[PDB]
Write an enzyme that holds these catalytic residues in place. Structure first.
Site, PDB file in Angstrom:
ATOM      1  N   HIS A 191       9.606  45.573  20.023  1.00  0.00           N
ATOM      2  CA  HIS A 191       9.656  45.465  21.228  1.00  0.00           C
ATOM      3  C   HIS A 191      10.960  45.949  22.108  1.00  0.00           C
ATOM      4  N   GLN A 211      10.940  43.469  34.948  1.00  0.00           N
ATOM      5  CA  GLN A 211      12.195  42.876  34.212  1.00  0.00           C
ATOM      6  C   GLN A 211      13.114  43.880  34.396  1.00  0.00           C
ATOM      7  N   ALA A 264       5.291  35.791  42.116  1.00  0.00           N
ATOM      8  CA  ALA A 264       3.988  35.430  42.784  1.00  0.00           C
ATOM      9  C   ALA A 264       2.777  35.673  41.804  1.00  0.00           C
ATOM     10  CB  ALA A 264       3.695  36.210  44.046  1.00  0.00           C
ATOM     11  N   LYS A 292      -0.616  37.247  39.967  1.00  0.00           N
ATOM     12  CA  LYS A 292      -1.114  38.781  39.991  1.00  0.00           C
ATOM     13  C   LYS A 292      -1.580  39.138  41.053  1.00  0.00           C
ATOM     14  N   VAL A 305      -0.227  42.272  43.198  1.00  0.00           N
ATOM     15  CA  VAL A 305      -0.790  43.427  43.390  1.00  0.00           C
ATOM     16  C   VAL A 305      -0.839  43.616  44.786  1.00  0.00           C
ATOM     17  N   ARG A 354       0.902  42.402  47.657  1.00  0.00           N
ATOM     18  CA  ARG A 354       2.317  42.766  48.160  1.00  0.00           C
ATOM     19  C   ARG A 354       2.887  43.976  47.556  1.00  0.00           C
ATOM     20  N   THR A 376       1.684  47.598  33.209  1.00  0.00           N
ATOM     21  CA  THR A 376       1.039  46.365  33.801  1.00  0.00           C
ATOM     22  C   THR A 376       1.265  46.831  35.565  1.00  0.00           C
TER      23      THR A 376
END
Lengths: 918, 822
Positions: A420, A732, A789, A791, A795, A797, A814
């Protein structure tokens, strides 16, 4: 009497000892003052060895005549033999006070204190002796011994040399001086002195052991082994030789024999705490965890001085998930001594798993400065930095990381990076595939313990009632986005020609999605309680089958068992897994053309349109329409609420943009937003804000429930300027590189009113981001960070901004789908690897040929255009809103149908005995 | 808890190091936060050289007090104790920031630089410490040390003087003081300060070693030996004390002892080229040809290296002719020694003296003065004593310059009377006074590189022309010397390359001895074999005429006595070792008794008046064998020469060789090597020490003299030629390798000169084999030893004065010295 005592002496000399002792007792009874009588008394007591008889006889003698000097010396000898030291010291004091000079008795007192344990006074009295006894072999020998005990070897060399002057050759003194040389680091001097000892006498086996210790200091494996074997032949009584021989043999690789040597050495004596450590280490190496923990605890309980025991027991607890116990062990180890950097490295790994990135970063820096070459610690420090996205010494760090990558690749050691983490360091495709293959065969090394015979793969569907037995296996059926992407497909999976098998491998959470998919499956399976991969593989083979990949806690070694004839990786890892047992891998031409197969370790199954999947058409259908994106509102009864309104402004597009006049309803909504109230009801419709939807319904906020109420959202809730073109991206810190951030700075400088919306992912890294932006010449107004916040609100916001962002470092999957369903457009630049080509293929399925840039400059130019060309921006936004529904992008049922078609292709290939292209 | 710490501090004050560490370990267990206790413990551990424990104590102390000056200073002191550079330097920085006003910190930092190399910053910190205060005279010490490293000599002298004036508590300062005193050349004060320091601290052995060096400059041999003893007993591992002790033993002739001590030095240091070469010289003396080639070639490497390394040449120029090295190498070493002269003469600060170019200042003559310490009992004076009396007072004026106290020998006062002027320079401790006296003498135109020769006087150049003749058989390398006397053959143009002086070719030779004066009584002799028995005396012819009959065997002949009563009585007296007898009124003696009968005549001071007899059998010499002979110093013999002799022996049926014990310690190895070369013990003969007259006289019985190709026998050649005796020689490489051939050419018997070692053996065996050849050669050499002017010391003076005429004609015409051809 005198004559009768001498006749007893004649008796002893002639061999009749008992007559001698009887006549001695008689003479003593006649006149106890006899000096010769006392001499014969002492001789008789020594021959008998009577401790109390000799003690009382000498007490009577000394009280009768205290002038006896050497008698007090033998008295001290007896007291030392008893072990009571205070009496011996008092007798030495009495003798010295009676007559000042007794260097021999001072040597006796020195050995007494050596037993007592105070080195310094011992060497002091040794020097006293060597002064008053310039020729005293014992004095110099014991002086060297005490110095060896105190590690002060230099004086010991001279003391032993003077003893050698006294005794020109003595094996014990040669071995002691050799130990002094070894502690001096004098390898050659030590081996020479040891060989001098052995040539003095080959009896001492510990001499052979120490000589082979010197050989190991020189590294001579076979010769040291021979010396140890010969020492065991002379004596296996002491297990130090056995211990070191077991150590070296363990280093040889012939494991279990050295293990048996270890265990029998410990059988000889438990005191070998080091051997206990070795035993527990090999137990961990074989997976015998609990006993290893017990042994480490034993060693600590007997030897609390050592700390690497704490280190290795923490390693065991890591193997057994005991984070708290492991941290306790690390605390104890560091408390003993922090100089053991790798303990701090493991603690840093713990903190990284715990999110305490700064502590891990500091510890890794301390370790690397301690030891320049700690490739694993260096890599993990780099990973922590990329977590916090601090680009201090960025490219030089990347360079040294590449160097360490090659260094570990050559020497057949585990790549310190993780698959990863691979996209954090764009190394060679060869590097990628090598790391993936090594990590995949890490499963093979574990599965080899049971040596399960290969399963007889079924070849036809007649066994499976003419249906395809498909087994979906993942521990991640729960609080995880992948479930939040494909959980509906098990229900949408066609049961006509296919049988559904679903395998949960983690403790359940009680979430609606969990039991939902469980009911979707023709067969749900809870494998989350099978510690043995073999048992699960047997269960699967019983199920006759015809998702996690490199993930935290994943145990995919069961795939290496290939219980199913067809094993293909898909959606588990962003790329190839380096698994020979992964026969195929499911991808698309857009992201994985046949020409990039050089880095692929699995066969390629071609999706005619798209590989990725998401079902916000079911996950969040309420947001299919809303009521251009400064203040937005949504709700279940959107059309009903609109028709309940007095007046509605209609914007033409079979679509429309619902617009509400700033009437009493709108003004009340604005007031409620500004006051941070819970929620209100208008026209009988529950009007809510997103700031506390969890306090309203956390389950609805999770998407398990579609929010039945109505939510109005404003950028002003975040304090944003409600009249500006705002860019956004929330992934991230890993997805962020300096070059792309500078290109974004160029974009923001080109666009007049240009700001960027960020999420604190994580939070504490904000100062570094601000400093980087300032060095890129953009004020604080251009960037805003926010807390996380759920999920649904994520989406919700997300569509607030007109355009999102793309990092060609790692593509958008994602958030890519989040914004594909948000109707807010975004542009992207494709990468080389799949993880940099996800959102690209998503948009190819979207079919926007103009949302791909073939260079960073093209990316910047198109970004500036779309953030500035507001008419073209509106056309693009409308086209996105239309196509996100018109396209089969979220037609998860037809996506399931095409997946079934691909399965048909796979089974036609396999059943005929034989990459899948459409 | 703390009370035990206080008690341990008291005990440390009492000086119990180990009780102190015990009590302080107890205290630190009692109080882990006892910063000052950790300080004291680390300090006492350092006192006892205990590094690691002090390291731990001080790390804890720093954890308890992050910054204390003396703390970090002594931390760095221990860092020095185990010797870590970066630790030291960084601790120095932390110290100087902690307390800038602490000189000793700078001092030890300078020490770190000294072991590192930043001598600049070293002196800088020296200056800084001086700025803070001059009280820390340690700084003065080590700064003067680095100045001595540099070479600011007098400034360093000032530094050492003022530092000692601060306090004498630092023996090393006194040591370096005396060292520089020795370097400049003052001795008495150096010795007094040596004693000062030893009184302060008798511990330092090499202190005594340098005391002994100063004493050897004072030439107190006993002082040298006693200092060697004290030094080596304090420390035998000091290789230099043993090396100089062995040097002094070599001075005393203790060659085996020197060899032992020099091998001791060599084991104490594998390559100490100084002691190495001195040991090599001792080996040459004893001729222990074991380890021959390795030792000599390592010496070759050493001399080349010191030519590169500009160090003191270990091989003395006397030994230059020994080691087979280059002409350039030898003249270069000579020039190095010339510099060793000029540097010392530089302190005399004397501008060059006036140099006359005329004869009027010398009343129409030329003033030539002769300087030496060999005036008296020395071979040179035994070679040319009468020539000063044979100098022409009409054209030259004679001046003598005594460099040694008078011994009262006949030659000494005889030459003192011969000279027009005598000077006793041996009374002048200053070279300047002697040079001034020479300039007073107006000298325009004798030991060379030898023992005790004040050649700095020649470096002072009080004479316009400075030449060396027959003083030392090697070049000087010192351009202040102008000329050197040689012949056409020994030193030709092709060898002129290795001379720093101008050459002077004599007519046929430049060698001369006083045999014609000191031993004329052997002009004719008295005794079918030729030289079985020899008898001579002043009244020899009178005794022969008093005999019943005397046989005459050929204007020249050989007197022969029949085996009558007198002859057989002489034979019996010889076999009895009688002191002397008198027959026909003629006293009959032997050289073996001339030690007591007439030591003065036995020394060549007097011609032996008595008639003296001697024959082979006096020392076991066979009376019917070919007896080759040579008796030079032992070191002049090498394995190759001995093997050439072995070939000559094996080419003669029964040949024996007569030798000397010079001294006797090496003879056993010599004969062992001879046996190794297939030479029976019967074929070699050794003899003990013999004074001049008898040792010369005993040669006539022997058959053939020998010459070592490396070095000729200067004295020996004249001794044998005055006997009319053949000798085998070959033209060699060095100047001293052609002297014997030069004398053979002077006699004109050129067939007695061999061109090679093979031809050497050829001519040796040819002479020792043929009776007619050997006898006729012996007789013709007997004839020509007088027929030739080879011993005409007066004609020698004549040709010397002619050469003086040519040289002064060249020089007085303004010409610098130039090679004299004819």
């Amino acid at each position: 009497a005198e004559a009768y005592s001498n006749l007893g002496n004649v008796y002893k000399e002639r061999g009749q000892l008992q007559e001698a002792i009887e006549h001695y007792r008689h003479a003593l009874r006649l006149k106890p003052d006899f000096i010769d009588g006392y001499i014969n008394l002492a001789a008789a007591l020594v021959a008998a060895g009577d401790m109390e008889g000799a003690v009382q006889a000498y007490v009577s003698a000394l009280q009768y005549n205290p002038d006896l000097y050497c008698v007090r010396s033998d008295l001290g000898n007896l007291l030392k033999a008893l072990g009571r030291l205070e009496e011996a010291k008092a007798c030495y004091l009495k003798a010295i006070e009676t007559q000042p000079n007794f260097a021999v008795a001072w040597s006796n007192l020195g050995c007494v204190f050596n037993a007592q344990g105070e080195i310094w006074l011992a060497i002091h009295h040794f020097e006293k002796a060597v002064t008053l006894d310039p020729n005293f072999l014992d004095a110099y020998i014991n002086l060297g011994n005490v110095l060896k005990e105190a590690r002060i070897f230099d004086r010991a060399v001279a003391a032993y040399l003077r003893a050698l002057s006294l005794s020109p050759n003595h094996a014990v003194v040669h071995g002691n001086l050799a130990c002094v040389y070894y502690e001096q680091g004098l390898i050659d001097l030590a081996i020479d002195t040891y060989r001098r000892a052995i040539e003095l006498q080959p009896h001492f086996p510990d001499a052979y052991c120490n000589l082979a210790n010197a050989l190991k200091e020189k590294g001579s494996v076979a010769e040291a082994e021979d010396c140890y074997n010969t020492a065991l032949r002379l004596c296996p009584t002491h297990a130090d030789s056995l211990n070191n021989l077991a150590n070296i043999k363990r280093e040889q690789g012939n494991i279990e024999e050295a293990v048996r040597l270890y265990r029998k050495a410990l059988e000889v004596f438990p005191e070998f705490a080091a051997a206990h450590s070795n035993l527990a280490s090999v137990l961990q190496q074989q997976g015998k965890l609990q006993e290893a923990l017990m042994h480490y605890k034993e060693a600590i309980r007997i030897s609390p001085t050592f700390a690497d025991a704490y280190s290795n027991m923490g390693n065991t607890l890591k193997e057994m998930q005991d984070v708290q116990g492991a941290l306790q062990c690390y605390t104890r180890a560091i408390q003993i001594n922090p100089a053991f950097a790798d303990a701090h490295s493991n603690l840093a790994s713990i903190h990284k798993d715990s999110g305490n990135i700064p502590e891990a970063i500091a510890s890794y820096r301390t370790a690397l400065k301690l030891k320049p070459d700690f490739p694993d610690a260096y890599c993990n420090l780099a990973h922590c930095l990329q977590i916090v996205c601090d680009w201090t010494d960025y490219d030089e760090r990347m360079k040294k990381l590449v160097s360490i990558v090659a260094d570990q690749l050559e020497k057949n050691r585990l790549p310190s990076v993780h698959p990863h983490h691979s996209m954090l360091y764009p190394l060679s495709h060869g590097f990628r595939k090598a790391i993936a293959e090594r990590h995949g065969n890490l499963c093979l090394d574990k599965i080899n313990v049971l040596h399960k015979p290969p399963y007889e793969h079924p070849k036809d569907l007649k066994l499976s009632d003419g249906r395809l037995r498909v087994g979906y296996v993942s521990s991640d059926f729960g609080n995880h986005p992948t479930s939040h992407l494909m959980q509906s497909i098990p229900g949408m999976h066609n049961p006509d020609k296919f049988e559904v098998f679903c395998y949960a491998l983690s403790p359940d959470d009680g979430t609606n999605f969990r039991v939902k998919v469980m009911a979707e499956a023709n067969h749900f399976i809870d494998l989350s309680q099978i510690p043995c991969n073999g048992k699960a593989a047997d269960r699967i083979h019983q199920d006759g089958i015809h998702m996690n990949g490199y993930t935290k806690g994943a145990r995919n070694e069961l795939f290496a068992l290939r219980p199913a004839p067809i094993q293909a990786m898909w959606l588990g890892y962003p790329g190839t897994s380096g698994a020979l047992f992964m026969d195929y891998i499911i991808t698309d031409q857009e992201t994985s053309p046949a020409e990039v197969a050089e880095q692929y370790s699995e066969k390629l199954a071609y999706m005619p349109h798209t590989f990725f999947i998401g079902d916000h058409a079911n996950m969040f259908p309420h947001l299919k329409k809303k009521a251009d994106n400064r203040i937005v509102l949504n709700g279940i009864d959107l059309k009903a609420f609109l028709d309940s309104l007095p007046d509605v402004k209609i914007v033409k597009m079979a679509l429309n943009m619902p617009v509400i006049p700033m009437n009493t309803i709108a003004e009340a909504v604005i007031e409620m937003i500004n006051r941070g109230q819970i929620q209100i009801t208008i026209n009988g419709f529950s009007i809510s804000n997103g700031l506390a939807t969890t306090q309203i319904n956390n389950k609805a906020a999770t998407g398990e429930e579609v929010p039945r109420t109505i939510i109005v959202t404003t950028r002003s809730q975040y304090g944003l300027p409600e009249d500006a073109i705002v860019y956004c991206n929330f992934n991230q810190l890993y997805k962020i590189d300096p070059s792309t951030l500078q290109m974004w700075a160029n974009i923001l400088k080109r666009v007049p009113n240009s700001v960027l919306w960020l999420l604190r992912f994580p939070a504490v890294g904000e100062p570094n981001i601000q400093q980087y932006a300032q060095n890129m010449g953009l004020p604080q107004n251009r960037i805003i960070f926010s807390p996380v916040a759920p999920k649904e609100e994520h989406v919700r916001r997300g569509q607030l901004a007109d355009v999102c962002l793309d990092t060609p470092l790692c593509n958008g999957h994602t958030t890519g789908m989040d914004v594909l369903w948000a109707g807010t457009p975004m542009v992207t630049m494709p990468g080389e690897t799949l993880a940099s080509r996800v959102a690209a293929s998503q948009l190819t399925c979207l079919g926007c040929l103009e949302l791909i840039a073939k260079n960073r400059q093209e990316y910047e130019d198109i970004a500036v255009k779309l953030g500035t060309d507001l008419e073209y921006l509106k056309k693009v936004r409308g086209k996105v809103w239309k196509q996100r529904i018109s396209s089969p992008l979220f037609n998860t049922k037809q996506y399931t149908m095409e997946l079934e078609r691909l399965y048909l292709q796979m089974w036609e290939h396999y059943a005929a005995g034989n990459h899948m292209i459409k």
